[PDB]
Amino acid sequence: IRMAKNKEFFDALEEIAESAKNDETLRNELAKVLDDILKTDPSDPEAFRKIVAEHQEFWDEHDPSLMEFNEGRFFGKSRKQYLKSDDFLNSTDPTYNFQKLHQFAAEQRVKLGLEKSDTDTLVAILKNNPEECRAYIESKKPGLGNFSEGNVHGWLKEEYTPTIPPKAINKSTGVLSDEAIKRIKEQARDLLLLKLINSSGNTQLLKDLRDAMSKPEAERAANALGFPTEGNGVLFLSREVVDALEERVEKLEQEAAKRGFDSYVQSL
């Protein structure tokens, strides 16, 4: 058991995002909830408790436990009072405080937008370094969130690395940490691999990836499938990608057997 609902809201954001993977209506609803959280100053605990509680209708549709107020404990407190206390959302939480919830929300908002993003954006996430990634995410507004000054609290002014042309960089590590960018790249990796797998008809190449026994072997196959070498640093085969690989090879082999049979059954 944990004090207050802080951790439950963390896990709820992830699990609702999961349920939104193929539910476009829920995606838009969750995007608005995340957008509202991100525009709120997490060092203003009253404004932050208020923006979370203001979406009670949304939270109730997914887990009534988040907004549940058992008047058995906290008996001297009304519901309106509880929703403003640390017993609802603990601002001094050692682990899941409002700053961490804000930072988590920024990462989820990007991943939410990545889900249906095109190939080129997945590749851009893998090719850009973390500073470049933050600026690129701003460039995609609002597809990956409204990451811009005044619309996400603490988002910094865009800077530039003096190449020709200047490359946009953003140093808002207090909003999207380097570790959040790393997990964003891991999700982009999986999303892109799944696209390349579905588009490929090269059964042997897909088998080479499916049967890879080491990272160099996986790199050679994935790169031949179109995965960018700039993503090799984060290349790791996850459960979902392995499962897609097995099913795709099986489908291609069934289809190949149905044709090789017919090219023979009416031939002779």
Residue numbers in the entry: 7 to 274
What's in the article?
The effector RidL binds the Vps29 retromer subunit, blocks retrograde vesicle trafficking, and promotes intracellular bacterial replication. The 131-kDa Icm/Dot substrate RidL binds the retromer subunit Vps29 as well as PtdIns(3)P and impairs retrograde trafficking. Here, we show that the 29-kDa N-terminal domain of RidL (RidL2–281) adopts a “foot-like” fold comprising a protruding hydrophobic β-hairpin, which determines the interaction with the Vps29 retromer subunit and displaces the regulator TBC1D5 from the retromer. Thus, the hydrophobic β-hairpin of RidL is critical for binding of the L. pneumophila effector to the Vps29 retromer subunit and displacement of the regulator TBC1D5.
Using this approach, we obtained well-diffracting crystals of the N-terminal 29 kDa fragment (aa 2–281) belonging to space group I422 with one molecule in the asymmetric unit. The structure of RidL2–281 was solved at 1.9-Å resolution. The electron densities allowed for building a model comprising residues 7–274. The structure features a “foot-like” fold, consisting primarily of interacting bundles of α-helices connected by loops of various lengths. The surface representation of B-factors indicates an increasing flexibility from the heel to the toes of the foot. At the heel of the foot, positioned between helices 8 and 9, there is a surface-exposed hairpin formed by 2 antiparallel β-strands connected by a loop comprising 5 residues (aa 160–180, termed “β-hairpin”). The β-hairpin is structurally well defined and rigid, as well as hydrophobic (based on surface charge distribution). The β-hairpin and in particular the sequence motif PTIPP at its tip is conserved among L. pneumophila RidL homologs. The three prolines in this motif break the antiparallel β-strands and stiffen the tip of the loop. Thereby, the side chain of the conserved Ile170 forms an exposed hydrophobic spot.
